[PDB]
Amino acid sequence: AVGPVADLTVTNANIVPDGFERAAIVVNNVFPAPLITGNMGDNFQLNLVNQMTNHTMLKTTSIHWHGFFQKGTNWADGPAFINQCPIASGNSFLYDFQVPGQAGTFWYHSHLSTQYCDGLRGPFVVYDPNDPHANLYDVDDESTVITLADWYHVAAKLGPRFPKGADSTLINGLGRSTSTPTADLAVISVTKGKRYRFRLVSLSCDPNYTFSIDSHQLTVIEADGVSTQPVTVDSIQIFAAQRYSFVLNANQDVDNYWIRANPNFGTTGFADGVNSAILRYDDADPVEPVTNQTGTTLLLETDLHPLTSMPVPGNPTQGGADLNLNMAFNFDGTNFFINGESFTPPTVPVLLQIISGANTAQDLLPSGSVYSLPSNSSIEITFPATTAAPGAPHPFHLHGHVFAVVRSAGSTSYNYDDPVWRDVVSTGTPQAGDNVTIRFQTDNPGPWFLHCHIDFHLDAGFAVVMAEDIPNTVNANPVPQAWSNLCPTYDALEPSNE
Ligand SMILES: *[C@@H]1O[C@H](CO)[C@@H](O[C@@H]2O[C@H](CO)[C@@H](O[C@@H]3O[C@H](CO[C@@H]4O[C@H](CO[C@@H]5O[C@H](CO)[C@@H](O)[C@H](O)[C@@H]5O)[C@@H](O)[C@H](O)[C@@H]4O)[C@@H](O)[C@H](O[C@@H]4O[C@H](CO)[C@@H](O)[C@H](O)[C@@H]4O)[C@@H]3O)[C@H](O)[C@H]2NC(C)=O)[C@H](O)[C@H]1NC(C)=O
Ligand SMILES: *[C@@H]1O[C@H](CO)[C@@H](O)[C@H](O)[C@H]1NC(C)=O
Ligand SMILES: [Ca+2]
Ligand SMILES: [Ca+2]
Ligand SMILES: [Ca+2]
Ligand SMILES: [Ca+2]
Ligand SMILES: [Ca+2]
Ligand SMILES: [Cl-]
Ligand SMILES: [Cl-]
Ligand SMILES: [Cu+2]
Ligand SMILES: [Cu+2]
Ligand SMILES: [Cu+2]
Ligand SMILES: [Cu+2]
């Protein structure tokens, strides 16, 4: 692990995580990117050193630290053309921020076009030295982080605009494709009698995964950075960019057990050990499992509740917030729309537009994609599922905030008492008549992206910007010189160096 102070050097390399070799983007020479760690409240000084050469996978980059509120450091949040211009190859840029009040399981990824799919993605864990759940487990370290990643044999800018599924599922960077049925599988080691805090991180560009471990129950204790009341289940469905911690008690026989991560589409099931890894007890032989799934209980989001009381902003009725927004989805075969408008990156990043003086949603580009939020207010946003936006279930993500999921996918109820707080939520399906509904309070001035975290959909415009407390965006987020220099440098590049 690296951090809280570290250089992250981004290069291109040929890698073979599923036994097939392809050109990719790696960080500190590895895919997934290395685990970054620190403790609650730490100052992260993460110096991104960009050495990429491959124009097809994009030579410039910008990094988002997923789930961190970035209060007062909106310029460090990462979305290209929202919070910064991209960093040029041959240059470095220091992300310098703090994580007060947060501890949990996070990740980081390129936030320029679909670049994270080509490899710039990895896990990020912030430990709590006084973790209230510490008594539930014995081991919590780099060996208990479990990443899930969809992997494509053809690069993001070379394959279909909307891929049909991934070629392999990688668990801790390893997995099999149908064409590589003997590729090395990841091994997660446990010792009989010990309890483990496994930190499950979706690095997905698109599919959700139904995750389980043969013969072992999973006690979920955290969702998207926020500690929850414990819930014991057999399987977890984890959407793109979500995170869970669960406790596993290694109380079965010394043996090998399959870890299963079944995507919603693509190559499904487990023939020849695709979509699989190995839970290997110490003292077991180094062979593949032959275990079966026995689980029957899939985690419901409605059974997730915060460990500490987190009251829901606003009145306990539909439309009961100070500002109530609905996000109406559409699609034209190529581009996605929200309330009739498709997100194309503006030339000038939204934060720099505001610094220059834009002070209404309507003076901000792209046209009709930016929403002004008043400060110190409760906000309700609904994301009704609709057949007008193919690719459901769309997992939506709000930057700068956690939010209360008052109504979850697959449920018709509204919980204003103790809903889960998290940062990525499935918006469900039109068949179920879903109308996923979130609440949050505006205490964090800055433009914050709100978008589907299926990266192919984001790149096709499925996004809006929450311009929170416009009058104090500049006051709250003083910018460093290096940030002010990004756009002039970027805009002076040849297009082939983008
Ligand atoms: C900057 O980054 C980019 C993006 O990462 C790099 O792009 C790469 O460019 C190369 C050259 O244009 C592309 O090559 C194609 O490579 C594939 C696969 O190579 C081969 O595997 C073959 C086996 O057949 C396949 O089985 C695999 C699974 O094993 C399946 O994935 C696949 O569908 C086939 O069934 C084997 O025959 C080869 O010897 C090699 O191992 C080739 O299939 C493909 O071949 C052609 O297809 C084209 C049209 O697409 C056609 O013209 C040919 O006649 C033949 O049918 C190409 O050779 C890579 O796919 C690109 N990589 C990615 C990830 O998209 C770029 O190289 C990089 N720049 C630098 C300087 O490094
Ligand atoms: C909310 O109100 C408090 C007290 O008036 C003020 O300190 C704070 O800056 C306000 N929050 C925002 C985001 O404007
Ligand atoms: Ca292309
Ligand atoms: Ca036995
Ligand atoms: Ca036994
Ligand atoms: Ca527009
Ligand atoms: Ca204010
Ligand atoms: Cl703190
Ligand atoms: Cl806030
Ligand atoms: Cu993210
Ligand atoms: Cu984010
Ligand atoms: Cu989507
Ligand atoms: Cu984002």
- Which method resolved this structure? X-ray
CB of 55 sitting under 6 A from ligand 1: no
The torsion of the CA quartet 484, 485, 487, 493, rounded to 10 degrees, works out to: 180
Q: Specify the CATH architecture of the domain 1-132.
A: Sandwich (2.60)
Ligand 13 mean position, distance from CA 340 (Å):
20
For residue 344, the tally of other CB atoms under 10 A from its CB is 15
Q: Is 297 left (phi over 0), alpha (psi -120 to 50) or beta?
A: beta
Which numbered ligand comes closest to the C-alpha of 154?
1
Q: Which CATH number fits domain 133-308: 3.50.50.60, 3.40.50.2000, 2.60.40.420, 3.40.190.10?
A: 2.60.40.420
Q: 3-state secondary structure string, the chain? A: CECCEEEEEEEEEEECCCCCCEEEEEECCECCCCCEEEECCCEEEEEEEECCCCHHHCCCECEEEECCCCCCCHHHCCCECCCECCECCCCEEEEEEECCCCCEEEEEEECCCCHHHHCCEEEEEEECCCCCCHHHCCECCHHHEEEEEEECCCCCCCCCCCCCCCCEEEECCECCCCCCCCCCCCEEEECCCCEEEEEEEECCCCCCEEEEECCECEEEEEECCEEEEEEEECEEEECCCCEEEEEEECCCCCCEEEEEEEECCCCCCCHHHCCEEEEEECCCCCCCCCCCCCCCCECCHHHCCECCCCCCCCCCCCCCCCEEEECCEEECCCCEEECCECCCCCCCCHHHHHHHCCCCHHHCCCCCCEEEECCCCEEEEEEECCCCCCCCCCEEEECCCCEEEEECCCCCCCCCCCCCEECEEECCCCCCCCEEEEEEECCCCEEEEEEECCHHHHHCCCEEEEEECHHHHHHHCCCCHHHHHHHHHHHCCCHHHC
Q: Residue 457 catalytic? A: yes
Per-domain boundaries in the chain:
1-132, 133-308, 309-498
Q: CA–CA separation, 234 vs 218, rounded Å?
A: 6
Ligand 5 mean position, distance from CA 253 (Å):
5
Which tokens in the block code for residue 80? 């290209």
Q: CA–CA separation, 210 vs 297, rounded Å?
A: 12
Q: Residue 133 catalytic? A: no
Asked, colleague to colleague, whether 1-132 and 133-308 share their fold, the answer is yes
Domain over 309-498 is classified CATH 2.60.40.420: yes
Query: Which residues surround the ion ligand 6 when the cut-off is CB under 5 Å?
Result: 341, 366-368
Q: What residue owns the CA closest to ligand 1's atom 57?
A: 154
Entry resolution (Å): 1.5
Q: What residue owns the CA closest to ligand 2's atom 10?
A: 376
For residue 300, the tally of other CB atoms under 10 A from its CB is 14
Q: What residue owns the CA closest to ligand 2's atom 1?
A: 376
Q: Is 143 left (phi over 0), alpha (psi -120 to 50) or beta?
A: alpha
Binding site per annotation, positions for Cu(2+):
64, 66, 109, 111, 394, 397, 399, 451-453, 457
Ligand 2 mean position, distance from CA 378 (Å):
13
Q: Residue 64 catalytic? A: yes
